[PDB]
């Protein structure tokens, strides 16, 4: 996969996802939602999309990833939508691992308006 | 895919998911969780399940999708469980795009009670 | 799939995921995040990872699953990171169904630093 940028790491073959990094320091008070820039652009492989999902180490602090879908044709900078749903302030440091990207297959079906059975 | 109902849109082939729409206007104060009706029933293709996941435009407002799994055999009306985890009230308008549905493959394995290695 | 432990249930072939159970009673005040033990270890099938995602019955109460990725090589006890993002206290009972595990395919790609097109 072609990438451009400094915020995504090669993964081990036994891991599902690539680490995504914060491109700058981010402060999140309780309740705050911010789009965290990663500095990364990429060319997803044809036939696939990208799921941005939490790291367990980050989720255990009460930070959540909102949204999560990178469409095959998305070519701009990846932002991770992060919310502090905990009741303690958190600071994410520049270059800290904040989420992971997992590549999954796409399925395209026509929608047919009819009668749902069963 | 056979659908019945007015709250799901055809997608571009370069997009992962189908937009899901609110079937009525929904108000969410901070902290409120509601099951938002979409008015949609569908027949998932055999061998697949449906992931309901957030839209980036909605997640950036601090709304989250809870749950997310539509099982292949589910034939009733799709509801999107939405929570306002932000600290500002939000109104979702009738027919607004509130989430997306992505079709993913199913894997069925027997569970065997034994000794986990490695 | 080889499992070791008392907190994961066989699934119907028409369901996407396996139920995960709380290994002990858990109290969550509003805003609290806890790693809920399941008592389960497993050997994911090679070529796959495990997505821990919410049950609709649990998500409708305003509990969310944070994180969610079990990597193919993970052999320790599965913990479900659960947060009460609602404004009502909740108690999860011992052996209650708290989340589901869905097995999904892995995709491994090399990252190539270059110029993103299109
Ligand atoms: Mg969430």
CSV table of N, CA and C in Angstrom, one decimal, chain A residues 1-5 8-18 41-43 45 48 51 53-56 59-60 62-64 75 85-87 100 102-105, chain C residues 14 30-33 35 49 51-52 64-73 81 83-87 104-118:
chain,number,residue,atom,x,y,z
A,1,UNK,N,0.8,-1.2,0.0
A,1,UNK,CA,0.0,0.0,0.0
A,1,UNK,C,0.9,1.3,0.0
A,2,UNK,N,0.6,2.1,-1.0
A,2,UNK,CA,1.3,3.4,-1.0
A,2,UNK,C,0.8,4.3,0.1
A,3,UNK,N,1.8,4.9,0.8
A,3,UNK,CA,1.4,5.9,1.9
A,3,UNK,C,2.2,7.1,1.6
A,4,UNK,N,1.7,8.2,2.2
A,4,UNK,CA,2.5,9.5,2.1
A,4,UNK,C,2.4,10.1,3.5
A,5,UNK,N,3.5,10.2,4.3
A,5,UNK,CA,3.3,10.8,5.6
A,5,UNK,C,3.9,10.0,6.7
A,8,UNK,N,1.9,6.6,10.2
A,8,UNK,CA,1.4,5.3,10.2
A,8,UNK,C,2.6,4.3,10.1
A,9,UNK,N,2.5,3.3,10.9
A,9,UNK,CA,3.6,2.3,11.1
A,9,UNK,C,3.4,1.0,10.4
A,10,UNK,N,4.4,0.4,9.9
A,10,UNK,CA,4.4,-1.0,9.4
A,10,UNK,C,3.9,-1.9,10.6
A,11,UNK,N,3.2,-2.9,10.2
A,11,UNK,CA,2.7,-3.8,11.3
A,11,UNK,C,3.4,-5.2,11.1
A,12,UNK,N,3.3,-5.9,12.3
A,12,UNK,CA,3.8,-7.3,12.2
A,12,UNK,C,2.7,-8.1,11.4
A,13,UNK,N,3.1,-9.2,10.7
A,13,UNK,CA,2.1,-10.0,10.1
A,13,UNK,C,1.2,-10.6,11.1
A,14,UNK,N,1.5,-10.7,12.4
A,14,UNK,CA,0.5,-11.3,13.2
A,14,UNK,C,-0.5,-10.3,13.8
A,15,UNK,N,-0.3,-9.1,13.4
A,15,UNK,CA,-1.3,-8.1,13.9
A,15,UNK,C,-2.3,-7.6,12.8
A,16,UNK,N,-3.5,-7.3,13.3
A,16,UNK,CA,-4.6,-7.0,12.3
A,16,UNK,C,-4.4,-5.6,11.7
A,17,UNK,N,-3.8,-4.6,12.4
A,17,UNK,CA,-3.9,-3.3,12.0
A,17,UNK,C,-2.6,-2.5,12.1
A,18,UNK,N,-2.6,-1.4,11.4
A,18,UNK,CA,-1.4,-0.5,11.5
A,18,UNK,C,-1.6,0.6,12.5
A,41,UNK,N,-1.5,10.3,4.2
A,41,UNK,CA,-2.4,10.0,3.1
A,41,UNK,C,-2.1,8.6,2.6
A,42,UNK,N,-3.1,7.9,2.1
A,42,UNK,CA,-2.8,6.6,1.5
A,42,UNK,C,-3.7,6.2,0.3
A,43,UNK,N,-3.3,5.2,-0.4
A,43,UNK,CA,-4.0,4.6,-1.5
A,43,UNK,C,-4.4,3.2,-1.0
A,45,UNK,N,-5.8,-0.4,-1.1
A,45,UNK,CA,-5.9,-1.4,-2.3
A,45,UNK,C,-7.3,-1.5,-2.8
A,48,UNK,N,-11.0,-2.9,-1.2
A,48,UNK,CA,-10.9,-2.8,0.3
A,48,UNK,C,-11.2,-1.4,0.8
A,51,UNK,N,-10.8,0.4,8.2
A,51,UNK,CA,-11.5,0.6,9.5
A,51,UNK,C,-10.5,1.3,10.5
A,53,UNK,N,-10.0,2.0,14.2
A,53,UNK,CA,-10.6,1.5,15.4
A,53,UNK,C,-9.6,1.7,16.5
A,54,UNK,N,-10.1,1.6,17.8
A,54,UNK,CA,-9.3,2.0,18.9
A,54,UNK,C,-8.2,1.0,19.2
A,55,UNK,N,-7.1,1.5,19.8
A,55,UNK,CA,-6.2,0.7,20.5
A,55,UNK,C,-6.7,0.4,21.9
A,56,UNK,N,-6.4,-0.8,22.4
A,56,UNK,CA,-6.8,-1.2,23.7
A,56,UNK,C,-6.2,-0.3,24.7
A,59,UNK,N,-8.3,2.9,24.5
A,59,UNK,CA,-9.6,2.7,25.0
A,59,UNK,C,-9.7,2.5,26.5
A,60,UNK,N,-8.7,1.9,27.1
A,60,UNK,CA,-8.8,1.7,28.5
A,60,UNK,C,-8.7,3.0,29.3
A,62,UNK,N,-10.6,5.5,28.5
A,62,UNK,CA,-11.8,6.2,28.2
A,62,UNK,C,-11.8,7.1,27.1
A,63,UNK,N,-11.0,6.9,26.1
A,63,UNK,CA,-11.0,7.7,24.8
A,63,UNK,C,-11.7,6.8,23.8
A,64,UNK,N,-12.6,7.3,23.0
A,64,UNK,CA,-13.2,6.5,21.9
A,64,UNK,C,-12.9,7.1,20.5
A,75,UNK,N,-8.3,10.1,-0.5
A,75,UNK,CA,-6.9,10.4,-0.8
A,75,UNK,C,-6.5,11.6,0.1
A,85,UNK,N,-14.6,10.3,26.5
A,85,UNK,CA,-15.8,10.0,27.2
A,85,UNK,C,-15.6,9.7,28.7
A,86,UNK,N,-14.3,9.8,29.1
A,86,UNK,CA,-14.0,9.6,30.6
A,86,UNK,C,-14.3,10.9,31.3
A,87,UNK,N,-14.1,10.9,32.6
A,87,UNK,CA,-14.2,12.1,33.4
A,87,UNK,C,-12.9,12.6,33.9
A,100,UNK,N,-5.8,2.4,15.3
A,100,UNK,CA,-5.2,1.5,14.3
A,100,UNK,C,-6.1,1.4,13.1
A,102,UNK,N,-7.3,-1.0,10.0
A,102,UNK,CA,-7.4,-2.4,9.6
A,102,UNK,C,-8.1,-2.4,8.2
A,103,UNK,N,-7.4,-3.1,7.2
A,103,UNK,CA,-7.9,-3.2,5.9
A,103,UNK,C,-8.9,-4.3,5.8
A,104,UNK,N,-10.1,-4.1,5.3
A,104,UNK,CA,-11.2,-5.1,5.2
A,104,UNK,C,-11.7,-5.1,3.7
A,105,UNK,N,-12.3,-6.2,3.3
A,105,UNK,CA,-12.9,-6.3,2.0
A,105,UNK,C,-14.2,-5.5,1.8
C,14,UNK,N,-26.6,-18.7,12.0
C,14,UNK,CA,-27.0,-17.4,11.3
C,14,UNK,C,-26.7,-16.2,12.0
C,30,UNK,N,-22.0,6.3,36.0
C,30,UNK,CA,-21.8,7.1,34.8
C,30,UNK,C,-20.4,7.6,34.7
C,31,UNK,N,-19.8,7.5,33.5
C,31,UNK,CA,-18.5,7.9,33.2
C,31,UNK,C,-17.4,6.8,33.5
C,32,UNK,N,-17.8,5.7,34.1
C,32,UNK,CA,-16.7,4.8,34.5
C,32,UNK,C,-16.4,3.8,33.3
C,33,UNK,N,-15.1,3.6,33.2
C,33,UNK,CA,-14.5,2.6,32.2
C,33,UNK,C,-13.9,1.5,33.0
C,35,UNK,N,-12.2,-2.7,32.5
C,35,UNK,CA,-11.9,-3.9,31.7
C,35,UNK,C,-12.6,-5.0,32.3
C,49,UNK,N,-8.6,-12.2,12.5
C,49,UNK,CA,-8.5,-11.5,13.8
C,49,UNK,C,-9.9,-11.5,14.4
C,51,UNK,N,-13.0,-9.2,16.2
C,51,UNK,CA,-13.6,-7.9,16.5
C,51,UNK,C,-14.5,-8.1,17.7
C,52,UNK,N,-14.3,-7.4,18.8
C,52,UNK,CA,-15.2,-7.3,20.0
C,52,UNK,C,-16.0,-6.1,19.8
C,64,UNK,N,-20.8,1.3,26.1
C,64,UNK,CA,-20.1,1.1,24.9
C,64,UNK,C,-18.8,0.2,25.1
C,65,UNK,N,-18.5,-0.5,24.0
C,65,UNK,CA,-17.2,-1.2,24.0
C,65,UNK,C,-16.1,-0.3,23.4
C,66,UNK,N,-15.0,-0.2,24.1
C,66,UNK,CA,-13.9,0.6,23.6
C,66,UNK,C,-12.8,-0.3,23.1
C,67,UNK,N,-11.9,0.1,22.2
C,67,UNK,CA,-11.0,-0.8,21.6
C,67,UNK,C,-11.8,-1.8,20.7
C,68,UNK,N,-11.4,-3.0,20.8
C,68,UNK,CA,-12.1,-4.0,20.0
C,68,UNK,C,-11.3,-5.0,19.3
C,69,UNK,N,-10.0,-4.8,19.2
C,69,UNK,CA,-9.2,-5.7,18.3
C,69,UNK,C,-8.4,-6.8,19.1
C,70,UNK,N,-8.8,-8.1,18.8
C,70,UNK,CA,-8.0,-9.2,19.2
C,70,UNK,C,-7.2,-9.7,18.1
C,71,UNK,N,-5.9,-9.6,18.1
C,71,UNK,CA,-4.9,-10.0,17.1
C,71,UNK,C,-4.7,-11.5,17.1
C,72,UNK,N,-4.5,-12.0,15.9
C,72,UNK,CA,-4.4,-13.4,15.7
C,72,UNK,C,-3.6,-14.1,16.8
C,73,UNK,N,-2.5,-13.4,17.1
C,73,UNK,CA,-1.6,-14.1,18.1
C,73,UNK,C,-1.8,-13.9,19.5
C,81,UNK,N,-13.3,-3.9,27.1
C,81,UNK,CA,-13.2,-2.5,27.7
C,81,UNK,C,-14.6,-1.9,27.6
C,83,UNK,N,-17.5,1.1,28.9
C,83,UNK,CA,-17.6,2.4,29.5
C,83,UNK,C,-19.1,2.6,29.6
C,84,UNK,N,-19.6,3.2,30.7
C,84,UNK,CA,-20.9,3.7,30.9
C,84,UNK,C,-21.0,5.1,30.4
C,85,UNK,N,-21.4,5.4,29.2
C,85,UNK,CA,-21.5,6.7,28.6
C,85,UNK,C,-22.9,7.2,28.9
C,86,UNK,N,-23.8,6.5,29.6
C,86,UNK,CA,-25.1,7.0,29.9
C,86,UNK,C,-25.0,7.8,31.2
C,87,UNK,N,-26.1,8.3,31.6
C,87,UNK,CA,-26.2,9.0,32.9
C,87,UNK,C,-26.9,8.3,34.0
C,104,UNK,N,-13.0,-12.0,11.6
C,104,UNK,CA,-12.9,-11.4,10.3
C,104,UNK,C,-11.5,-11.6,9.7
C,105,UNK,N,-11.4,-11.6,8.4
C,105,UNK,CA,-10.1,-11.9,7.7
C,105,UNK,C,-9.1,-10.7,7.9
C,106,UNK,N,-7.8,-11.1,8.0
C,106,UNK,CA,-6.7,-10.3,8.0
C,106,UNK,C,-6.1,-10.0,6.6
C,107,UNK,N,-5.7,-8.8,6.4
C,107,UNK,CA,-5.0,-8.4,5.2
C,107,UNK,C,-3.6,-7.8,5.5
C,108,UNK,N,-2.5,-8.4,5.1
C,108,UNK,CA,-1.2,-7.9,5.4
C,108,UNK,C,-0.6,-7.3,4.1
C,109,UNK,N,-0.3,-6.0,4.1
C,109,UNK,CA,0.4,-5.3,3.1
C,109,UNK,C,1.6,-4.5,3.7
C,110,UNK,N,2.6,-4.5,2.8
C,110,UNK,CA,3.7,-3.7,3.0
C,110,UNK,C,3.3,-2.2,2.8
C,111,UNK,N,3.9,-1.3,3.7
C,111,UNK,CA,3.7,0.1,3.4
C,111,UNK,C,4.9,0.6,2.6
C,112,UNK,N,4.5,1.3,1.5
C,112,UNK,CA,5.5,1.9,0.6
C,112,UNK,C,5.4,3.4,0.6
C,113,UNK,N,6.5,4.1,1.1
C,113,UNK,CA,6.4,5.6,1.2
C,113,UNK,C,6.6,6.1,-0.3
C,114,UNK,N,5.6,6.8,-0.7
C,114,UNK,CA,5.6,7.4,-2.1
C,114,UNK,C,4.7,8.6,-2.2
C,115,UNK,N,4.0,8.7,-3.4
C,115,UNK,CA,3.2,9.8,-3.6
C,115,UNK,C,1.7,9.3,-3.8
C,116,UNK,N,0.8,9.8,-3.0
C,116,UNK,CA,-0.6,9.4,-3.2
C,116,UNK,C,-1.2,10.1,-4.3
C,117,UNK,N,-1.8,9.4,-5.3
C,117,UNK,CA,-2.4,9.8,-6.5
C,117,UNK,C,-3.9,10.0,-6.4
C,118,UNK,N,-4.5,10.5,-7.4
C,118,UNK,CA,-5.9,10.5,-7.8
C,118,UNK,C,-6.7,11.7,-7.2
